[PDB]
Design a binder for these strands. Sequence first.
RNA 1: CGUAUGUUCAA
RNA 2: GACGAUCAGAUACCGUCGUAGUUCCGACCAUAAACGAUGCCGACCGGCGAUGCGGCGGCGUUAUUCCCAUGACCCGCCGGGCAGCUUCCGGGAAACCAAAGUCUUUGGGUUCCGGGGGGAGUAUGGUUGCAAAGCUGAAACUUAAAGGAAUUGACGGAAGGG
Lengths: 134, 25, 83, 222, 129, 222, 83, 99, 71
Amino acid sequence: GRVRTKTVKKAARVIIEKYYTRLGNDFHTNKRVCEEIAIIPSKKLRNKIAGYVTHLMKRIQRGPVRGISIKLQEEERERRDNYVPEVSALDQEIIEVDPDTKEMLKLLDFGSLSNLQVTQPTVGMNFKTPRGPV
Amino acid sequence: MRAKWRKKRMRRLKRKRRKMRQRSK
Amino acid sequence: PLAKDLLHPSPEEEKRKHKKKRLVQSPNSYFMDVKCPGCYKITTVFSHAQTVVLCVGCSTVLCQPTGGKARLTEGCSFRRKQH
Amino acid sequence: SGALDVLQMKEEDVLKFLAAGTHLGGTNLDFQMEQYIYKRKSDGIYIINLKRTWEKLLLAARAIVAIENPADVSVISSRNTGQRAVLKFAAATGATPIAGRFTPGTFTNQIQAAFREPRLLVVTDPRADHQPLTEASYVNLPTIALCNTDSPLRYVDIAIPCNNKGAHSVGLMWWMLAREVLRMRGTISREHPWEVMPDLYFYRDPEEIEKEEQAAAEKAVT
Amino acid sequence: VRMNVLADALKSINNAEKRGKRQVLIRPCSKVIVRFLTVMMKHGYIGEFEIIDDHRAGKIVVNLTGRLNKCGVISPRFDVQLKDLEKWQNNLLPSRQFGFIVLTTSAGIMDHEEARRKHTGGKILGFFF
Amino acid sequence: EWMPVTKLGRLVKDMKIKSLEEIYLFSLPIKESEIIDFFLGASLKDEVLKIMPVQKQTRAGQRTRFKAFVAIGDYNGHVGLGVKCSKEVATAIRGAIILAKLSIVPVRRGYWGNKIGKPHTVPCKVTGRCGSVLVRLIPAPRGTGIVSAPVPKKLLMMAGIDDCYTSARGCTATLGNFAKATFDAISKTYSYLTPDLWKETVFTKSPYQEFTDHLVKTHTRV
Amino acid sequence: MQNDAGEFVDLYVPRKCSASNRIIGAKDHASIQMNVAEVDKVTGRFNGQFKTYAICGAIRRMGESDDSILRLAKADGIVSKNF
Amino acid sequence: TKKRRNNGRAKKGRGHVQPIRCTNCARCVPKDKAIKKFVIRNIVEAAAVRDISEASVFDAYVLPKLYVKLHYCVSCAIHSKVVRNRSREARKDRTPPPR
Amino acid sequence: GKCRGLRTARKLRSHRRDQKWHDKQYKKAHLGTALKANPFGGASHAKGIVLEKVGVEAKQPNSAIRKCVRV
RNA sequence: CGUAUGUUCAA
RNA sequence: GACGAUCAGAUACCGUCGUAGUUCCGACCAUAAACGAUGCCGACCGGCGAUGCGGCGGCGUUAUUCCCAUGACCCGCCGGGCAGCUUCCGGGAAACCAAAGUCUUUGGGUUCCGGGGGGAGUAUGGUUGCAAAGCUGAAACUUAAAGGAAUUGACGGAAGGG
Ligand SMILES: [K+]
Ligand SMILES: [K+]
Ligand SMILES: [K+]
Ligand SMILES: [Mg+2]
Ligand SMILES: [Mg+2]
Ligand SMILES: [Mg+2]
Ligand SMILES: [Mg+2]
Ligand SMILES: [Mg+2]
Ligand SMILES: [Mg+2]
Ligand SMILES: [Mg+2]
Ligand SMILES: [Mg+2]
Ligand SMILES: [Mg+2]
Ligand SMILES: [Mg+2]
Ligand SMILES: [Mg+2]
Ligand SMILES: [Mg+2]
Ligand SMILES: [Mg+2]
Ligand SMILES: [Mg+2]
Ligand SMILES: [Mg+2]
Ligand SMILES: [Mg+2]
Ligand SMILES: [Mg+2]
Ligand SMILES: [Mg+2]
Ligand SMILES: [Mg+2]
Ligand SMILES: [Mg+2]
Ligand SMILES: [Mg+2]
Ligand SMILES: [Mg+2]
Ligand SMILES: [Zn+2]
């Protein structure tokens, strides 16, 4: 019967977002931190919040979680933006097209004007999964 | 009372009534 | 499609639609010029023929009735007639 | 494109669409998306018409530009393959993005915290983002969508026929939409190719991220 | 079987009108249908229509302008005297400001207001508004 | 006092929008009762049609709640109907009045057969359906008055209709459905295409673009 | 609405759908009025003029708002005739 | 109130379907209405399959299976927990439960 | 549905004549059995002789002795 | 395996 | 029907027997929740995957030893059918229905048939039948509800989880 109520969890997640840098994996230090950065009216409540904070810190330090943490934030921007390849994936020497869209590109008056290769069309048109149960 | 048995009740009642008139004619 | 032009449908659209349901009904059948490998003369044969057409004089079967278009005898060349 | 040679499709765009597979639709066809396909391939795949893709793309761009305040344009992608593409578009054009979960009540609950009243809505997929499209119906909100061959068109006013499934094509279509919006606004030059690479709007699954980061790390160390 | 070509035509126009279609195919075609359509055309309720000749009853394609609320037939074709025309108007038309009752009279097929002007009663064909 | 939360409420308070018909013209969803109070505050008159208790069966007994039907409207082209259910009668009435104001629609009034003077009747025969109740509004000769039951007669007077013949079918004892059906009939007067509305519509500026600059200056901060 | 004199007695004149020509009612919250900006002939850049289209809620519900807008644009020259 | 569009049975374009007898109680049930269950299982249970293996006289003898087709009336199917009650919308689902 | 042909006046008249017997208000006043069976014989009032005073027990959910007379 | 019943009115 | 159980009783459910019947042929009977509880003929009105029959078209696979056609399969179209999914077509008291829609914006044609619940499908007359009965079919009198669909609870010798 050790499930923590929303009041324990709401305080603990907030403390790690707000004061992550001053927290760590030790319950005893975290317990002392909560005494000055928060007004916890009872000692038992304080030790429960510090308990969850200690549990969260391990998880927030081995991966991202519901809680936000600048260090994890500044990496998300870097992947989402910083990884622009040297050459685009679209920049391909040979682009493969089937005679169907090649004749379409002829309507696009772009057929023979491009650097593209024509594949042999697929034969048999077996593209539907067999019908039946499951 | 079930309608089917209410029908059976009346059929038996009718048969009795027809015997009562076949006896008087 | 709310605004579909019913006066001028595509020939592909008319060719798909049922012959009676076309804008102006037309048969899907036709007549043909059948030449059996023997002799030289040409026979006019209905596409959906119901009778076994015999090349008179030559006395050979030109087409066999089916549930639809008549089945031409093997070795017989046919060409669609135009009206 | 108003049959204007300045807005015609260039050979550079054609290679971009072909490379990203934007011309390949699904095996199913919506009856209201019939006018946008070209021909079914021999493997059941419907080919989307690129002229019609371009026309609707520019028609969508003209609708976006008509909104005076760029913040009044909302761009949404519930699916992850398009969350990065949408936020960039919102950074490059000043739109208000909603990536990830769309909380119901956003456009209709006046007292909700994230309550907003956009003048124009752009979504990545009508099926996935069905909540914003259905909700827009309560507040007189015109809607623009990227629709595949098998995509419903209910409450969708401008549908851009494109492969809104593949990662490359979804990002490319948002890139082309962003570029065309800026060109009409005059923010960027039209004869000069855009500085933003198309790959910046491409969603990258985690497996590729750790694969390439260690490849870059081993490249740097040696 | 088809007992009334005019009823089939007016119903077909009414359904396409409600569905927002721009054109409706009407089959088969009759002089009564064409004269009825003309009465609606002269009042702007429908656009141009093209009768199509099939060496048969005929087909028509009507251009719909999104103005009809309802084009309904009256069956059977009751005889309408001039005195009883007003009671027919109160029963068939939403208001006297608009809407017409199409009458077939000896003078010709015409709307109820033209019949009143020409002082001719007749047999009622239908209505539109 | 009134701090508007919606853009429409912001423009109304800033006196940028005049008359409800401009809001009605673009069919904007009103979401604040103060907008209605701003335009028609003095002329609106309210009436409690019915206080109908409803009960929910529970273990401990019957949970009685009170439903209030309130009809609102100035006696000149505007009428609204509001239904609210709550634990208290007084709370239900106040909530119904708010909902009644939010529901106000413009009433189109026409002429029986003259076109002399101001409009006195409904433009044409209009029917309203709610559940089994069918209420049919019929144009009436000038000087006829309102020939109806007491329930629709209150709504029709509040709509400003001066002459109207009526025809009700169904369980009119269901005052909730009876009133709603009448309200539906009145509502669709302006949804009925009379040939006088045939002339091509001229498109004006939406309030969200005509005052897009004012909204950016104020509503972003407020 | 005008009396015999010709004074406008309607409270307001409601818009009509640009495709179905139905009146857009005061409570039709699914209706839209979407502006499509017109570019300069040479620049291809918003010059300040826009085309306006109104669609009623019913057309949007049917999913026909796409072809209504597209067909309106082709009529207005926004979309090339060889679409 | 109608509960099922197909009236609880698979009869659509015919008048009469021959009945069959329930496997448990032998009640007459129409063949299209009977809850059917084609049971395939090994003659020997998985507990005893090991003992038969080294008791067998063959090096690689595959155990024959038991093919029994059961037909259940509605009462027996519900009682024997072959089928259960479902909600309003859960009833409409027709795919068999996952393996 | 109902017939509507221009020469169906007899069929419509005949049908309404038959279906008018199916509401008890019409059949009570037009069959004659009701008037024959009516103790007043179609009169508003009637005189009589009190045979005896009788008490009728009121129906549930009430309880009382209603005072009556056999006449 | 195998059991049935619950006086009248009344919130 | 007999019997054995079960039970307070058990003229039942369970079990052991078992007559009529069940079966074939010939003559009757004319009713069923004879149900899609939904008349028929005709027109219009969304989409999608199938399916059965017929025809037409088309890469390719397989047998017909090679050819030929023909079959088996694959991809479509058309027509008639049994249905299914979806839909703010529209309707409806709702359950629901692509018809139960195109209805107060009320009329394609036409047949049968209902008018609060009972009494009562009873009486009586006619008619059919070997009979059982079928068909036609009232009245006196009595009554303020009977009923439909759906909601919330409670209950269940219903299920599932605690
Ligand atoms: K009592
Ligand atoms: K079929
Ligand atoms: K219940
Ligand atoms: Mg039941
Ligand atoms: Mg059902
Ligand atoms: Mg079953
Ligand atoms: Mg009566
Ligand atoms: Mg008593
Ligand atoms: Mg009492
Ligand atoms: Mg007792
Ligand atoms: Mg007792
Ligand atoms: Mg009791
Ligand atoms: Mg009490
Ligand atoms: Mg015994
Ligand atoms: Mg036995
Ligand atoms: Mg019967
Ligand atoms: Mg049967
Ligand atoms: Mg029946
Ligand atoms: Mg017959
Ligand atoms: Mg068949
Ligand atoms: Mg009727
Ligand atoms: Mg009765
Ligand atoms: Mg008899
Ligand atoms: Mg009482
Ligand atoms: Mg019943
Ligand atoms: Zn059983």
